[PDB]
Amino acid sequence: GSHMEKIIKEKISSLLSQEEEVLSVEQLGGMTNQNYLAKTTNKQYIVKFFGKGTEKLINRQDEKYNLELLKDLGLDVKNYLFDIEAGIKVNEYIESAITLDSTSIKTKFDKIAPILQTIHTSAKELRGEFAPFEEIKKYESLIEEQIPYANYESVRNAVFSLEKRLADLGVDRKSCHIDLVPENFIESPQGRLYLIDWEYSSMNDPMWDLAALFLESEFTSQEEETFLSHYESDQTPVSHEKIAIYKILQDTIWSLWTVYKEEQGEDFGDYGVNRYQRAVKGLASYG
Amino acid sequence: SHMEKIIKEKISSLLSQEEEVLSVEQLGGMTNQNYLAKTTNKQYIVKFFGKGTEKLINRQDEKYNLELLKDLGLDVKNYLFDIEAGIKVNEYIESAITLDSTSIKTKFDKIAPILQTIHTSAKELRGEFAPFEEIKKYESLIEEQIPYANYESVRNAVFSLEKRLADLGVDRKSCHIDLVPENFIESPQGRLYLIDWEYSSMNDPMWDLAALFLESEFTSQEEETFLSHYESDQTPVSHEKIAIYKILQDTIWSLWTVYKEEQGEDFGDYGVNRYQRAVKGLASYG
Ligand SMILES: C[N+](C)(C)CCO
Numbered sequence: 001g002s003h004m005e006k007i008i009k010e011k012i013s014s015l016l017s018q019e020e021e022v023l024s025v026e027q028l029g030g031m032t033n034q035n036y037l038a039k040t041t042n043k044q045y046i047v048k049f050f051g052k053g054t055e056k057l058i059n060r061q062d063e064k065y066n067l068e069l070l071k072d073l074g075l076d077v078k079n080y081l082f083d084i085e086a087g088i089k090v091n092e093y094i095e096s097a098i099t100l101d102s103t104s105i106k107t108k109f110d111k112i113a114p115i116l117q118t119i120h121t122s123a124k125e126l127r128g129e130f131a132p133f134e135e136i137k138k139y140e141s142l143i144e145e146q147i148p149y150a151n152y153e154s155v156r157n158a159v160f161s162l163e164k165r166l167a168d169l170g171v172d173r174k175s176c177h178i179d180l181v182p183e184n185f186i187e188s189p190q191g192r193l194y195l196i197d198w199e200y201s202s203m204n205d206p207m208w209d210l211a212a213l214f215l216e217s218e219f220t221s222q223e224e225e226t227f228l229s230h231y232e233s234d235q236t237p238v239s240h241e242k243i244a245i246y247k248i249l250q251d252t253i254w255s256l257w258t259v260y261k262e263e264q265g266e267d268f269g270d271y272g273v274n275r276y277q278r279a280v281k282g283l284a285s286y287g
Numbered sequence: 288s289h290m291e292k293i294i295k296e297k298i299s300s301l302l303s304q305e306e307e308v309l310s311v312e313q314l315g316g317m318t319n320q321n322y323l324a325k326t327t328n329k330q331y332i333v334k335f336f337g338k339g340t341e342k343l344i345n346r347q348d349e350k351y352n353l354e355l356l357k358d359l360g361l362d363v364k365n366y367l368f369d370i371e372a373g374i375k376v377n378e379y380i381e382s383a384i385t386l387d388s389t390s391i392k393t394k395f396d397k398i399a400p401i402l403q404t405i406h407t408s409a410k411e412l413r414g415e416f417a418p419f420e421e422i423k424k425y426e427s428l429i430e431e432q433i434p435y436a437n438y439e440s441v442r443n444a445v446f447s448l449e450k451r452l453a454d455l456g457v458d459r460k461s462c463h464i465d466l467v468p469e470n471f472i473e474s475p476q477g478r479l480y481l482i483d484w485e486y487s488s489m490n491d492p493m494w495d496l497a498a499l500f501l502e503s504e505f506t507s508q509e510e511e512t513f514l515s516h517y518e519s520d521q522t523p524v525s526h527e528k529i530a531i532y533k534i535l536q537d538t539i540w541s542l543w544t545v546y547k548e549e550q551g552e553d554f555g556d557y558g559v560n561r562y563q564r565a566v567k568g569l570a571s572y573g
């Protein structure tokens with residue numbers, strides 16, 4: 001316990017049917033939000049309190065709209081409560097589910113590719129657009145201290161030169177998840193894969209999501225080619241160069257996100273610097 | 288030579304009063320019979336349509352297509368196109384550099400915008416290049432049995448790619464269809480010409496890219512570099528489609544070779560080597 005325990009009980013009893021009590025409340029990991037697992041008599045619930053500083057990062061009204069909008073696709077787990085004023089959301093917790101990792105993900109291509117095809121060709125108009133260069137400027141002005149990363153102004157300029165390349169290649173605007181870390185995929189006992197945690201989801205080019213999938217799980221070149229044969233279709237075209245560019249933009253943006261989050265109280269060790277350095281490496285190989 | 292005579296006869300109407308034919312030599316070439324006529328002030332390519340090629344190429348469409356493609360300024364000047372005589376006469380670019388599989392690798396910045404120009408031309412060429420239909424076409428034209436080993440099984444494998452292409456999406460654009468490096472000619476004034484449009488037809492642009500890569504044996508790094516010059520919002524690129532079209536080209540042109548050899552040509556090992564590269568491609572693709 002206890003006051004956090006009290007709040008969590010104070011906030012999920014309205015979901016508890018006649019004759020039901022909370023057995024235990026456990027803290028979970030997580031990067032964006034303050035997460036808990038509430039175990040009850042009948043079932044378990046994921047409780048997510050909006051993380052430190054995230055109000056500037058995520059439009060929570062947009063997120064709520066997007067959760068409702070995407071429900072019929074059946075990709076995510078259920079949301080039981082989404083209460084913006086209280087700063088809380090409660091999701092279904094899938095029992096005996098397996099959370100994917102960078103190793104186990106390599107065995108699930110035939111399940112992941114159709115999930116991504118589903119969202120990318122859904123025609124869903126999400127509230128909010130992910131404009132990568134605008135996002136960089138966003139994190140720049142949110143960060144109070146100077147950005148700690150070496151040679152930033154020059155790296156930033158090299159990164160911004162990619163905007164013209166993207167415009168020349170053509171940028172698509174489709175519903176995207178935006179954050180394809182392997183832990184966002186869970187497999188239930190029946191063998192059904194779910195894609196969870198849509199809080200960053202926004203309109204973007206689908207090559208962003210492919211880049212994220214590949215980067216976050218460190219796909220090999222062969223693995224990328226094999227995944228792409230699962231994914232590529234008339235309705236889901238693939239540009240390899242766009243993927244390479246979005247990998248650089250992602251490392252750039254999330255390294256900045258890390259600086260912001262760490263000013264808001266977090267500590268992610270070397271997460272931020274490692275991503276930044278990978279962006280620099282990506283730039284050198286690209287250019 | 289009676290050859291001398293008919294050549295003089297044909298380009299006669301192009302020459303003036305004391306303008307004369309200095310010499311005539313035989314050129315290389317795989318589809319037609321080609322000759323260089325050197326005259327007082329101009330040099331001309333004289334092309335006699337190859338034996339049996341009327342079955343392969345619609346010459347009336349080719350003439351039409353020539354006219355339609357003129358305002359793009361890609362080809363050299365055509366002076367004569369006589370279907371009845373079975374002859375065309377083009378300008379021969381003096382002291383031009385004919386590109387080869389080596390020199391083509393230094394010309395990406397000139398080639399990519401040529402291919403962008405044709406592929407985004409919005410022009411409706413007469414003739415559609417449907418590769419699986421083209422395979423069936425060659426099979427019907429070939430009189431003896433196709434000599435290639437295990438052909439039925441290989442053909443089966445090749446035809447299994449029709450459905451893959453349909454699932455990837457097939458575009459329909461004006462294409463050159465025959466991008467051997469020798470079809471690129473560099474003038475001493477600096478411009479690159481793309482010549483010999485006789486196979487040009489509506490097709491997926493990934494076919495032209497596959498032909499360019501395959502005929503000059505691009506390395507994968509060279510392909511990637513080339514695609515950096517070519518890829519754009521208007522000219523999107525699919526790596527898998529390029530790989531499939533390479534297999535299709537090797538198959539089709541191996542059959543073209545059997546057909547041509549039945550007309551009396553001898554291309555040495557060209558046919559079997561292309562067929563076997565399709566076999567190799569199919570193995571590497573699966
Ligand atoms: C959003 N990050 C990519 C920074 C990790 C969160 O899943």
Ligand SMILES: C[N+](C)(C)CCO
Pocket residue numbers: 317318465467540543
């Ligand atoms: C048409 N081939 C590809 C067989 C060679 C002619 O350029």
